[PDB]
Amino acid sequence: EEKEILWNEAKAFIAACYQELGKAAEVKDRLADIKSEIDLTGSYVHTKEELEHGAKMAWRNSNRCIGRLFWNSLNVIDRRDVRTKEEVRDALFHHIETATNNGKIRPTITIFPPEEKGEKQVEIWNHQLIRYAGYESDGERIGDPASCSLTAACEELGWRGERTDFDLLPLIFRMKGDEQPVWYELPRSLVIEVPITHPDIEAFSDLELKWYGVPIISDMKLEVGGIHYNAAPFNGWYMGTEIGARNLADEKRYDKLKKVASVIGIAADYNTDLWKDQALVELNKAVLHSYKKQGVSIVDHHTAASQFKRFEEQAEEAGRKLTGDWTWLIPPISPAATHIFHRSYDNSIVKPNYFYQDKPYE
Amino acid sequence: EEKEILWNEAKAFIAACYQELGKAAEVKDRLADIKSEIDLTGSYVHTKEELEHGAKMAWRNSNRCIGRLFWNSLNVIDRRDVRTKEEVRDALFHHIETATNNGKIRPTITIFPPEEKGEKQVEIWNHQLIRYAGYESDGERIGDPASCSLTAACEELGWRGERTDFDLLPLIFRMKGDEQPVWYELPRSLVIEVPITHPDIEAFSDLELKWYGVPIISDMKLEVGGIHYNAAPFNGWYMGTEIGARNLADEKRYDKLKKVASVIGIAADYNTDLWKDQALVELNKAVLHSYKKQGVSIVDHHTAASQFKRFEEQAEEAGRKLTGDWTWLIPPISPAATHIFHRSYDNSIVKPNYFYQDKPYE
Ligand code: HEM
Ligand code: HEM
Ligand SMILES: Cc1cc(N)nc(COc2cccc(OCC3CCNCC3)c2)c1
Ligand SMILES: Cc1cc(N)nc(COc2cccc(OCC3CCNCC3)c2)c1
Ligand SMILES: C[C@H](O)[C@H](O)[C@H]1CNc2nc(N)[nH]c(=O)c2N1
Ligand SMILES: C[C@H](O)[C@H](O)[C@H]1CNc2nc(N)[nH]c(=O)c2N1
Ligand SMILES: [Cl-]
Ligand SMILES: [Cl-]
């Protein structure tokens, strides 16, 4: 049955991929080649063209992503050749470097060898290649609470964090055959961080807030034509709200809204004063201002929504069905000021796509 | 089949209603009475107790309502006895008066005779008993655009609006047997309006904004035990965002955000300045402040969310399944600052409930 799934998915993908690439006539021969290869080896190997476009199609089908307009300009790095943890580490290091691009962020995906028969060749433990550690012990909470479990797992493996609020987690991944994952400290020269300041309010720097430049999802599975790339880290640039309205605002994250209200000089006593709402706006203005001042790529949620509208138009123009998750597409601040809020979306799963997978820790 | 639907719904409602009222033992006899009455007349008549609790159950099942905590304190006015348009008008006038309660708004529903065999006894054309007219002609737009079609329909019937931005629409409803609906101008002494001022910014009054005190939905069908009350106007108090973030903010409504940005002294040039977001906050602070200053009941979205959390707890406590529409429950500003955003809801339709129905105009 597993083979049948692979072949069925392969047929659907190769047809669709080759149609889009204008290689329609080559479908029959390519499928035959694949049909034998599956019959022989229990799997098949993508061409670079199929892989590159498959990763682009997968971004295009990401229902929760508001930034899908630029799906076709995705930078794909093919690292199916890696065999050693040294190679994995250097690929991950390289991904950070080239994607960061001195602030002018390049949407990039590095693709590692896929699962053979459910067996992972490489298993990345990081949720993001760049993320802050989190600590919770006897009342004392430090750093990013969302990283508490991974941090504890890393401290099992001989790593120790400095316990600032912004400890960079090391890269941690496990190779096929090894029982334990290895970990490597990130070179600080590879990680751009942005100090959060406010354009008008000088006291905002007293919060001593900062965030990393590049969000690189590293725990999701890329599925292309029945092939499971469990290790394929990808990145874009931040939408400001992700940092200002969530990472730094959520009670179960950095929980900074009360201190923001204090530095911007407003009371945090009454719900009717809408101080949380005011704090969210100024903090999100601070985030956008800070990234721009440092020359690190970022987009506000209004501009992002406009771009997503173009994506919707582009999709209809090309005769493709649009899919999307309304609950995720709406920004967490002023969503009714975007068009997204005022229309509906089909939340169907189309492949190729990126999927969740179980954590090896926890 | 229609009778079978009525009887099936009647069985489900009477059982459930009487369980909750602790009148469990009376279910059998009451159902027999109903079974004969349906067999005889093609319908059945609710007791005052069933009607009152049915309307309360219906509010409790309103998936899109964030204010369901106070479902059991709903003030039910039984006007199934009305036969004349004079009686309908005076009932509607009375509803406005008693619900307004000099600002201390009482959640109230006035229930008119139900459909007999799909035939409406009374047909209310108003979307809300109190709403502003809207005009669009050769480029010129005046008032509330959402009322454009109803306003045009009213001006067919001999009514004429003054064409201010806040013309009160007349009550307009049609009686069984009449081809045309009648219309009655609202007494201004019955309608509380709130001038919008800002607590800190004096120039906000230059916008000359205002809104009516009491939102009274009048075009929805209340369904109770198979009985269709197509005319049953209900009201609560406003959540501030409904006015500040939607009615006065939407481009297809009053579209006031640019003028708000001007009076609060910020530029409306760059998306990255988040001026819309800032304008939304100050305008919503203005709305809340204004209603409080006038002693007209209103609730901010944070407090409302807290109350809705209690409703969720109350529901689990009493062993009732919770249903809700996530897309409607989240407030249009700072939704991620509420618990609603961070959990999911089953959007199943439970009866009794309130439903949409076709407009007689349009
Ligand atoms: C170009 C800049 C990009 C922007 C501004 C953007 C924007 C967003 C945002 C705001 C989210 C929601 C994240 C959250 O709430 O946690 C998101 C989710 C997502 N984006 Fe993008 N994105 C970008 C690039 C990409 C790229 C390059 C890919 C992959 C090829 C991608 C795939 C996804 C996926 C899979 C999710 C869902 C993750 C999840 O389920 O939690 N995006 N995007
Ligand atoms: C007590 C004060 C109340 C508050 C603060 C409240 C809050 C809300 C809000 C904010 C909405 C969304 C409206 C919109 O976005 O257009 C809503 C919808 C709704 N509420 Fe309530 N509500 C209250 C009382 C009531 C009452 C008394 C009923 C009926 C018995 C009711 C039934 C509904 C229904 C049926 C809807 C959905 C209307 C639609 O589908 O568009 N609510 N409520
Ligand atoms: C590619 C990208 C761009 C962007 N602007 N922002 C992001 C952030 O995306 C996130 C941020 C946090 C969680 C998440 O979901 C992936 C995990 C998978 C395991 N379950 C929890 C969610 C995805 C990514
Ligand atoms: C009872 C109540 C309380 C409250 N705070 N706010 C409202 C406002 O509710 C609305 C406000 C606008 C539209 C609407 O929906 C009913 C119509 C039915 C016909 N289709 C369009 C929506 C419901 C009601
Ligand atoms: C398409 C989408 O369902 C629509 O814009 C909804 C979203 N959530 C909402 N929520 C409320 N309270 N009121 C609304 O009118 C809407 N509109
Ligand atoms: C329960 C609900 O789906 C959950 O809170 C979602 C809502 N929408 C979201 N949207 C984004 N972009 N990111 C999120 O983490 C969430 N969380
Ligand atoms: Cl993030
Ligand atoms: Cl309204």
- Whether residue B307 lies within 8 A of chain A, CB to CB, comes out as no
Task: List the structure tokens of B334.
Answer: 């700072």
Q: Measured in Å, how far apart are chain A's first and last C-alpha atoms? A: 31
CB atoms A337 and B280 under 8 Å: yes
| Helix-then-strand count for chain A, H and E | 10, 16
- Whether residue A258 lies within 8 A of chain B, CB to CB, comes out as no
Please give, one letter per residue, the 3-state secondary structure of A178-231.
CCCCEEECCCHHHCCEEECCCCCCHHHHHHCCEEECCCEECCCEEEECCEEECC
Backbone angles phi, psi at A76, to 5 degrees: -100, 120
- Whether residue A303 lies within 8 A of chain B, CB to CB, comes out as yes
Q: Decide: A78 and A47 in contact? Cβ < 8 Å.
A: no
**C-alpha to C-alpha distance for B323 and B167, rounded to whole angstroms:** 38
Q: Which residues of A154-179 are buried (b: 16+ CB within 10 A; e: fewer)?
A: beeeebebeeebbbbbbbbbbbeeee
Which residue owns the Cα nearest ligand 3 atom 7? A215
Closest CA to B276 of B326, B332, B328, B331: B332
Q: Which residue is catalytic, options A68, A79, A131, A174?
A: A68
Among A272, A277, A284, whose Cβ lies nearest the Cβ of B333? Answer: A277
Tell me the residue ranges of DSSP E strands in B152-237: 171-175, 182-184, 193-195, 210-212, 216-217, 221-224, 227-229, 234-235
Q: Which residue ranges of B make up the annotated binding site for heme? A: 65
Contacts of B22 (CB under 8 A, 6+ apart): none
**C-alpha to C-alpha distance for A250 and A243, rounded to whole angstroms:** 10
Angle at B346 between CA B344 and CA B347, to 5 degrees: 115
Which residue owns the Cα nearest ligand 1 atom 41? A64
Among B249, B280, B300, whose Cβ lies nearest the Cβ of A272? Answer: B300
Contacts of B94 (CB under 8 A, 6+ apart): B77, B110
Confirm whether A242 is a catalytic residue.
yes
Q: What is the DSSP letter of A243?
A: I
**C-alpha to C-alpha distance for B193 and B294, rounded to whole angstroms:** 9
**C-alpha to C-alpha distance for B71 and B354, rounded to whole angstroms:** 13
**C-alpha to C-alpha distance for B208 and B291, rounded to whole angstroms:** 15
Centre of ligand 7 from the C-alpha of residue A331, in Å: 14
Which positions in chain A touch B334 (Cβ < 8 Å)? 276-277, 280, 332-333
Angle at A198 between CA B288 and CA A210, to 5 degrees: 110
- Whether residue B272 lies within 8 A of chain A, CB to CB, comes out as yes
Q: How was this model experimentally determined?
A: X-ray
**C-alpha to C-alpha distance for B95 and B84, rounded to whole angstroms:** 17
Contacts of B230 (CB under 8 A, 6+ apart): B114, B115, B120, B122, B123, B221, B222, B357
Q: Which residue ranges of B make up the annotated binding site? A: 65
Tell me the residue ranges of DSSP E strands in chain B: 75-78, 108-111, 122-124, 134-137, 140-143, 171-175, 182-184, 193-195, 210-212, 216-217, 221-224, 227-229, 234-235, 238-239, 298-299, 353-355
Among B285, B326, B332, whose Cβ lies nearest the Cβ of A273? Answer: B285
Q: Decide: A69 and A310 in contact? Cβ < 8 Å.
A: yes
Q: How distant is the alpha carbon of residue B212 from its chain centre?
A: 13
Which residue owns the Cα nearest ligand 2 atom 17? B65
Task: List the structure tokens of A241.
Answer: 């709200």
Alpha helices in A21-109 (DSSP H): 27-41, 48-60, 85-100
CB atoms A303 and B271 under 8 Å: yes
- SS3 call for A299: strand
Task: List the structure tokens of A79.
Answer: 């690292």
| CATH level 3 topology of B193-215+238-303 | 3.90.1230
Closest CA to B324 of B71, B59, B64: B64
- Whether residue A332 lies within 8 A of chain B, CB to CB, comes out as yes
- Whether residue A347 lies within 8 A of chain B, CB to CB, comes out as no
**C-alpha to C-alpha distance for A26 and B231, rounded to whole angstroms:** 64
**Burial label, B191 (beta-carbon count in 10 A; 0-12, 13-18, 19+):** middle
**C-alpha to C-alpha distance for A243 and B198, rounded to whole angstroms:** 30
Q: Decide: A148 and A361 in contact? Cβ < 8 Å.
A: no
Q: What is the dihedral of CA B189, B194, B195, B197, to 10 degrees?
A: 160
- Whether residue B315 lies within 8 A of chain A, CB to CB, comes out as no
**Burial label, A257 (beta-carbon count in 10 A; 0-12, 13-18, 19+):** buried
Which string of DSSP letters, residue by residue, matches A348-360? ---SSEEE----S
Mutate to test the pocket of ligand 4, among B127, B301, B359 (most ligand atoms within 8 A of CB): B127
Q: Decide: B122 and B231 in contact? Cβ < 8 Å.
A: yes
Ligand 3 pocket member A181 (CB < 6 A): no
CB atoms B334 and A337 under 8 Å: no
Which residue owns the Cα nearest ligand 3 atom 9? A217
Asked if omega into A352 is within 30° of 0 (cis), the reply is yes
Closest CA to A1 of A226, A220, A228: A226
Ligand 2 pocket member B299 (CB < 6 A): yes
Residue type, position B211, single letter:
W
Which string of DSSP letters, residue by residue, matches A150-185? HHHHHHHTT-----STTPBPPEEEEETT-SS-EEEP
Centre of ligand 7 from the C-alpha of residue A209, in Å: 15
Domain extent listing, chain B: 1-80+107-117+221-235+305-329, 81-106+121-192+356-360, 193-215+238-303
Q: Measured in Å, how far apart are chain B's first and last C-alpha atoms? A: 31
**C-alpha to C-alpha distance for A133 and A152, rounded to whole angstroms:** 9
Q: What is the DSSP letter of B244?
A: I
**C-alpha to C-alpha distance for B16 and B175, rounded to whole angstroms:** 33
| Helix-then-strand count for chain B, H and E | 10, 16
Helix A2-20 × helix A27-41 angle, to 10°: 160
Q: Mutate one of B270, B334, B345 to test the A interface: name it (highest A CB count within 10 A).
A: B334
The structure tokens 């529409």 sit at: B325
Among A245, A274, A326, whose Cβ lies nearest the Cβ of B281? Answer: A274
Contacts of B92 (CB under 8 A, 6+ apart): B110, B129, B171, B173, B233
Q: Mutate one of B247, B264, B274, B345 to test the A interface: name it (highest A CB count within 10 A).
A: B274
Residues with CB under 5 A from ligand 7 (ion): A 215
Confirm whether A237 is a catalytic residue.
yes
Residue type, position A129, single letter:
L
Confirm whether A4 is a catalytic residue.
no
| CATH level 3 topology of B1-80+107-117+221-235+305-329 | Nitric Oxide Synthase; Chain A, domain 1 (3.90.340)
Which string of DSSP letters, residue by residue, matches A248-264? TT-TTTT--HHHHHHHT
* Ligand showing the shortest atom-to-Cα distance for residue B58: 2
Contacts of A319 (CB under 8 A, 6+ apart): none
C-alpha neighbours within 13 Å on the C-beta side of residue A303 = 15
Which residue owns the Cα nearest ligand 3 atom 4? A238
**Helix or strand holding residue B177 (H, E):** none
Which positions in chain B touch A246 (Cβ < 8 Å)? 336
The structure tokens 């012990």 sit at: A137
Resolution, in Å, please?
Answer: 2.1
Centre of ligand 3 from the C-alpha of residue A217, in Å: 6
Sign of CA dihedral B88, B90, B93, B98: negative
- CATH 3.90.440.10 matches A81-106+121-192+356-360: yes
Which atom of ligand 2 approaches the CA of B109 most closely?
30
Confirm whether A20 is a catalytic residue.
no
**C-alpha to C-alpha distance for B292 and B210, rounded to whole angstroms:** 14
Window 207-246 of A: residues touching B by CB (8 A cutoff) are 245-246
**C-alpha to C-alpha distance for A325 and A329, rounded to whole angstroms:** 6
Task: List the structure tokens of A170.
Answer: 């090391």
Centre of ligand 4 from the C-alpha of residue B131, in Å: 12
**C-alpha to C-alpha distance for A281 and A273, rounded to whole angstroms:** 14
Which residue owns the Cα nearest ligand 5 atom 5? A342
Centre of ligand 2 from the C-alpha of residue B328, in Å: 10
Backbone angles phi, psi at A166, to 5 degrees: -135, 50
- SS3 call for A332: coil
Q: Decide: B100 and B214 in contact? Cβ < 8 Å.
A: yes
Among A249, A272, A334, whose Cβ lies nearest the Cβ of B276? Answer: A334
